[PDB]
Amino acid sequence: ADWEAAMLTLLMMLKVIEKADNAAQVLTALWFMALAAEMAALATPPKLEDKSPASPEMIDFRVGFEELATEIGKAIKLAALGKVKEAQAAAEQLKTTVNAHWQKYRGGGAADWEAAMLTLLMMLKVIEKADNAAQVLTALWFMALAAHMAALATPPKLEDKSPASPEMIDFRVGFEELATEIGKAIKLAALGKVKEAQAAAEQLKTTVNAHWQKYRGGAADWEAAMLTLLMMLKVIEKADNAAQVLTALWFMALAAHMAALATPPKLEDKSPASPEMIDFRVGFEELATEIGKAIKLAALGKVKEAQAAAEQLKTTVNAHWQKYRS
Ligand SMILES: [Zn+2]
């Protein structure tokens, strides 16, 4: 993505974290912080545009940025355990790292199992008390978010094991089954099936509870993500504060990331080397690129200039969704 867009996303999310009351809104914003760090992992500040990836200056930028991702995860588990005030206290130390990292590269002119599992459970709580299709979709995407950030994680009772020993291997299938269920529930929440999606979340917490209890201690479909992009665009234009523009745009970048290797229902009989599928790859990369440019406008505070870019963004998702609509 764009380094300035994510760093100002971190700063704006740290700002809404201090203005939060319960642990859920601290957890969601902290996950939006981990979201901005993931999509801007391979980014590059405008100060370092002419340096090399092996340069010491750029090397320090990489670990200094992973220190930020590590600190975001530590604050997420504090927000996952319910320690709402110890998590907001960790956000205070988080702002010191974000500010010092931002200034050093200023424009010029997570991975914890128990945090995501407690996020999945807490997101299952916010799904059961959902009104419309928007919040169940966002919560289900936060579930796909937590499963993506804890992909290579490890339960506390299995770090000593072996990524080849079936005990850890059995943990890998049971967790990919979880991301599979989350994606199937998003597909129902995307098609407007509000009650059928919450019914899918019922059996989903069955998988979550059986998985969490087995390791406690002592994704995305193309049409599901495209309907998410289209639905998030509905939320963008019916809002007027930069944060909810930014959150919806990050859900758009979220939906484009989880369905990066996806395939429309019309194109699975083709090959990943046939140009009909190759045009689908660049055409989808054009979409994630436009979403990043609109986040930059929403991160700089330009609430309108970002919403203006969202209308032109809808022109791109509509032409893309129709050409692979079946
Ligand atoms: Zn990712």
Q: How far is the CA of 185 from the centre of ligand 1 (A)?
A: 20
Burial of 218 (C-beta count, 10 Å sphere; 0-12/13-18/19+) = exposed
Q: For residue 78, what are its two tokens?
A: 């504090």
Q: Ligand 1 centroid to 38 CA: how many Å? A: 6
d(CA 91, CA 254): 23
Q: Give me the helix-helix angle, 3-18 and 84-104, nearest 10°.
A: 150
Ordered DSSP codes for 230-265: HHHHHHHHS--SHHHHHHHHHHHHHHHHHTTT---T
Task: State in Å: Cα 149 to ligand 1 middle.
Answer: 7
**Angle in degrees, CA 208, 209, 210, rounded to 5:** 95
Ligand 1 center–CA 145 separation, angstroms:
9
- Compute the distance between CA of residue 265 and CA of residue 24 in angstroms, rounded to an integer: 35
Ligand 1 geometric centre to CA of 179 (Å) = 13
Residue 62 DSSP SS3: helix
Whole-angstrom CA distances from 107 to 78, 98, 104, 282 are 32, 14, 9, 29
Task: In the chain, list all ranges with CATH 1.20.120.10.
Answer: 3-110, 114-219, 224-323
- 44 Cα to the center of ligand 1, angstroms: 17
Structure-solving method: X-ray
> Closest Cα to residue 156, out of 99, 101, 256, 77?
77
- Structural contact between residues 222 and 262, judged by C-beta atoms closer than 8 angstroms: yes
What kind of fold does domain 3-110 have according to CATH?
A: Four Helix Bundle (Hemerythrin (Met), subunit A) (1.20.120)
Hey, is 84 helix, strand or coil? Answer: helix
Cα of 218 vs centre of ligand 1, distance in Å, is: 30
Measured CA to CA, the distance from residue 191 to residue 280 in angstroms comes to: 22
Q: Please compute Rg for the chain using Cα positions.
A: 20
Ligand 1 centroid to residue 151 C-alpha, Å: 9
User: Ligand 1 centre from 40 Cα, in Å?
Assistant: 10
d(CA 109, ligand 1 centre) in Å = 31
Whether residue 228 contacts residue 186, with contact meaning beta carbons closer than 8 Å, is answered with yes
d(CA 111, CA 133) in angstroms, rounded, equals 29
d(CA 41, ligand 1 centre) in Å: 9
For CA atoms 17, 22, 27, 29, the dihedral sign is: negative
Residue 211 tokens, joined: 């998985």
Residue 261 amino acid letter: L
If you measure from the C-alpha of residue 255 to the centroid of ligand 1, how many angstroms do you get, rounded to a whole number? Answer: 11
Phi, psi (deg, nearest 5) at residue 42: -85, 25
Residue 265: what are its φ and ψ, rounded to 5°? -60, -15
Contact yes or no for 84/26 (Cβ under 8 A): yes
Q: How far is ligand 1, taken at its centre, from the CA of residue 35, in Å?
A: 9
Q: Which residues contact 317 (CB under 8 A, 6 or more apart)?
A: 226, 229, 230, 233, 287
Q: What tokens does 235 get?
A: 């939320």
Enumerate residues preceding breaks in the chain (C to N > 2.5 Å).
109, 218
Ligand 1 midpoint to CA 6 (Å): 15
Give the Cα separation of 180 and 171 in Å (integer): 14
Q: Are 219 and 258 in contact (CB under 8 A)?
A: yes
Element holding 304 (H helix, E strand): helix 303-323
Cα 41 to Cα 54: distance, rounded to the nearest angstrom: 16
The rounded Å distance from CA 257 to ligand 1 centre is 6
Q: 142 CA distance to ligand 1 centroid (A)?
A: 13
Q: What's domain 224-323's architecture?
A: Up-down Bundle (1.20)
HSE-CB at 248 with a 13 A cutoff on CA atoms is 27
Homologous superfamily, domain 114-219: Cytochrome c/b562 (1.20.120.10)
Residues 6+ apart with CB under 8 A from 7: 36, 40, 98, 101, 102
